[PDB]
Each structure stands twice: as structure tokens, then as C-alpha cells.
Amino acid sequence: LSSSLKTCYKYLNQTSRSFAAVIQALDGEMRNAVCIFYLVLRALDTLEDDMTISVEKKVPLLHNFHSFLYQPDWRFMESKEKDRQVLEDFPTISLEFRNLAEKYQTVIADICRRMGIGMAEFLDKHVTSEQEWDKYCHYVAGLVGIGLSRLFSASEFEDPLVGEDTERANSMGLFLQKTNIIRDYLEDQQGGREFWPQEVWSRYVKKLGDFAKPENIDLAVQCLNELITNALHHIPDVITYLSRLRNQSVFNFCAIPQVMAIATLAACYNNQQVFKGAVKIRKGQAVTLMMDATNMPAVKAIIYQYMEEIYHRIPDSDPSSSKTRQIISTIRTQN
Ligand SMILES: COc1cccc([C@H]2O[C@H](CC(=O)N3CCC(CC(=O)O)CC3)c3cccn3-c3ccc(Cl)cc32)c1OC
């Protein structure tokens, strides 16, 4: 491997940790394609996330990021974030992007252009409606799902339907993103970040930060349950998406995050701790999930056991109780 590609995989291990191994297991040309897409997305997210970068500087950065892929000298030295090396050494990453077959470069570049437009749109608004939540998640995660799917089909390891069905790929991203947004309430609150949809939380409290106060914990948990029930709606599409995959290494890459989000939603459901700290699945639990998630019967079994767990925890008085039961019933009966 070239020095530059070695450096890319080092950044992948620094930035994705135990997830790097799953990416390194991808067959043939998919391996480098996904490694570089992952790093390019890390760089874009670092720019987006950086509250030290003014809106006037950030908008052109987000809008033009797709072009930087083609600018050998482009770098960004002013980031204060944790993964800033990918920005400071962007020339090494973009060199390797330019070394990919053009069919992969063109996927990545298009996705970055579209994601940048959307990210820029959300700099001067919080999320209002559930529809706006889906739009926000499309921009930061659904389009990742779409991009990856196109790499899978373009590499010919998966059927063209995988790349073309934007809605199923979109749902892969939305599921993950909403699970993270839900679980991360408190850390976001403390960071000055608000991603829970205003249309939903404003039905319980006056300000989103009110859920951190002990007197509102019943209302906070009801809102949590409502948002979780929303995220569960993506599961049918996740099942459909995963069921079409014929390459083992692609399957494992796609399935791993999905089963870990499933377990995380189960851990968070009706859980007051969401408002006191970071609820996480245990490392040994995550390792088993990762090892198990290698075929459809196995993944469906996992989904079913965690959905059943949530089903039996639904408080009768929960405002979303009938909605939660219905989505769980739908999931259990399709497969
Ligand atoms: C078809 O679409 C995907 C297939 C596989 C993975 C992803 C997605 O997974 C991570 C999930 C994730 O990062 N984690 C952390 C590590 C975990 C595994 C471990 O602990 O080792 C799984 C969940 C994620 C969440 C939100 C955005 N992404 C994302 C960014 C970039 C790429 Cl290339 C792919 C992803 C996909 O994007 C939706």
C-alpha cells in the first residue's frame, strides 16, 4: 500500500475504532472506496459540527466541499474538533479519493455536494416538524446510506436495486441517526445542541432543556417513548434492505450498526437514565451482536427479541402505547 493509503487506514482506525475492522473486511474495491468515503464524511461532519467556524465561513465550506475533493492542495487548518487531523491532512485523503475508480469518486462527490447543501440549510434553524426531522436526518445520514448503496452496486458486488432504492437506503441512515439523536439528548443539551423535533417535545414542555429537570421526568420519558416509536417505523425498510444483500462482507458491514441501534433503542425505551446520562449497551453485548449479525434469520431473531422486550415494557398509560404496539405488530408479521 502507498504511504498515503496507509495513512488513510490509520485515520480510519483512529476515527472509527472497532468499526474499522468491519470496513477492512469488505471485498475487493469496496474496501478502499468505503474507507475513503468514511474519512471524507468525517471531514465534512467535523466542519459542520465546529461551533468555532462562523456561519459566513461555514456556508461556502459546506457548499464547496465536494469541489475540494478535486483540489490537491486543499486543507483546513482552523478546526478545534477531535478529528481535525482528517481536515489538516485532507490532501492525503483527497489524493486517495482521486485514486479510486471514477465510478466511485462520482458517487462520493455527488453525495458530498447534496449533503453540503442540506447541512448549510440547517445552520440557522432547529428541527421543527417530524417531517423536518426526516429532512435533517436525510442530509446527515440518509444520504450516507444512499452513497454506500451506490458503491455496493457500482462495484458489482450487489444487484443494481441496492444502489437504486434510495428510500430503503435512506431508512438505513434515518434509523441510526434517530437512535443516536434520541440516546444523546443530555450530552447534546449540555453542548448547546438541540435535535429533538420541536413539534414533538413542545407537546410536553416549554423548552427542550426542561427534560433535564427532575420535576419533568415523567413528561421527558413520554416524549422519549414517542420518539422511539417514530424511529421504529424504519425497521420494515431496514429488514427489506438487509434481505437483498448477497455479499457477506457487505451484509456484515450493513447489519452491524442496525442490530446495535435496535439494542440501544431497547435499552433507552421508558428509561429515565436517558435524562441523567449516556445509556450505552455493554461492550460484551455489542461484541456478541456483531458476531451474530451475519445472516437474515439471525438478524430478524435479534430484532424480534428486542422488539418483544420493548413490547412487554410499554406502560398502559403511555400516550404512544397503541402506536408502539402497532409498529411492533407490523414488524413481527412481515417476516
Ligand atoms: C448502507 O448504509 C450503511 C451501512 C453501514 C454503515 C452505515 C453507517 O454506520 C454508522 C454506524 C457507526 O458509526 N457506529 C459506530 C461503530 C459500531 C460498531 C462497533 O462498535 O465496532 C456501529 C455503529 C453511522 C451512523 C450514522 C452515520 N453513519 C455512517 C457514517 C459513515 C459510513 Cl461510511 C457509514 C455509516 C451506513 O449508513 C447508513
Swiss-Prot record:
The Swiss-Prot or TrEMBL record lists the needed cofactor(s) as: Mg(2+)
Transmembrane stretches in the record are: 249-269
Keywords (alphabetical) are:
Cholesterol biosynthesis, Cholesterol metabolism, Endoplasmic reticulum, Lipid biosynthesis, Lipid metabolism, Magnesium, Membrane, Metal-binding, Multifunctional enzyme, NAD, NADP, Steroid biosynthesis, Steroid metabolism, Sterol biosynthesis, Sterol metabolism, Transferase, Transmembrane, Transmembrane helix
> Topology relative to the membrane, per the entry?
Multi-pass membrane protein
Q: Which organism is it from?
A: Homo sapiens (Human)
Location(s), subcellular: Endoplasmic reticulum membrane
Q: Which reaction does it catalyse?
A: 2 (2E,6E)-farnesyl diphosphate + NADPH + H(+) = squalene + 2 diphosphate + NADP(+); 2 (2E,6E)-farnesyl diphosphate + NADH + H(+) = squalene + 2 diphosphate + NAD(+); 2 (2E,6E)-farnesyl diphosphate = presqualene diphosphate + diphosphate; presqualene diphosphate + NADH + H(+) = squalene + diphosphate + NAD(+)
Any idea of its EC number?
2.5.1.21
Q: What does the entry list as the binding residues for NADP(+)?
A: R17, R42, R183, K280, R282
Return the protein name.
Squalene synthase
Residues shown, of full length: 36 to 370 of 417
Q: Which GO terms describe its cellular component?
A: endoplasmic reticulum; endoplasmic reticulum membrane; membrane
Source organism phylogeny: Eukaryota, Metazoa, Chordata, Craniata, Vertebrata
Purpose of the protein = Catalyzes the condensation of 2 farnesyl pyrophosphate (FPP) moieties to form squalene. Proceeds in two distinct steps. In the first half-reaction, two molecules of FPP react to form the stable presqualene diphosphate intermediate (PSQPP), with concomitant release of a proton and a molecule of inorganic diphosphate. In the second half-reaction, PSQPP undergoes heterolysis, isomerization, and reduction with NADPH or NADH to form squalene. It is the first committed enzyme of the sterol biosynthesis pathway.
State the tissue distribution. Widely expressed.
Gene of origin? FDFT1
Q: Name one GO molecular function term.
A: squalene synthase [NAD(P)H] activity
**Where is it chiefly localized?**
endoplasmic reticulum
Q: Which family does the entry's similarity section mention?
A: Belongs to the phytoene/squalene synthase family.
Q: Name one GO biological process term.
A: cholesterol biosynthetic process
UniProt-annotated binding residues for Mg(2+): D45, E48, D49
- Pathway in which this enzyme or protein is active: Terpene metabolism; lanosterol biosynthesis; lanosterol from farnesyl diphosphate: step 1/3
Top-tier EC class? transferase
Tell me what disease the record lists for it: Squalene synthase deficiency: An autosomal recessive disorder characterized by profound developmental delay, brain abnormalities, 2/3 syndactyly of the toes, facial dysmorphisms, low total and LDL-cholesterol, and abnormal urine organic acids.
